[PDB]
């Protein structure tokens, strides 16, 4: 239910916390800090105008 979608030209990627999580926080009503893995995205379809 938590995801980061990167778009760059025709390259669209969706990295979620199920497969790219670096630290999974607790499960409570208070503040939940979410940190993800270092995301390496290939962006070569960008239309450089």
């Amino acid at each position: 239910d938590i995801k980061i979608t990167v778009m760059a030209g025709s390259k669209t990627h969706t990295f979620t916390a199920s497969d790219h999580i670096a630290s999974l926080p607790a499960n409570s009503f208070d503040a939940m800090p979410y940190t993800f893995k270092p995301l390496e995205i290939d962006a070569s379809s960008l239309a450089f105008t």
């Binding site: 607790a26 409570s28 009503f29 208070d30 503040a31 800090p33």
Partner: protein, 49 residues
């Protein structure tokens, strides 16, 4: 960096005094305890620091 979330204050568990003392242990050449922090608990919600 370490994030600590401490539960709500309890007269049964924590006791008569809500405030707490965080201590660090085996460091340098000292095996004993050294008070590293002092915190004020909350009786309404968990405390994160």
């Amino acid at each position: 960096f370490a994030n600590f979330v401490l539960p709500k204050y309890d007269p049964a568990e924590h006791g008569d005094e809500r405030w707490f003392k965080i201590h660090i242990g085996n460091v340098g050449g000292n095996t004993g305890r050294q008070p590293y922090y002092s915190g004020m608990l909350s009786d309404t919600s968990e405390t994160s620091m």
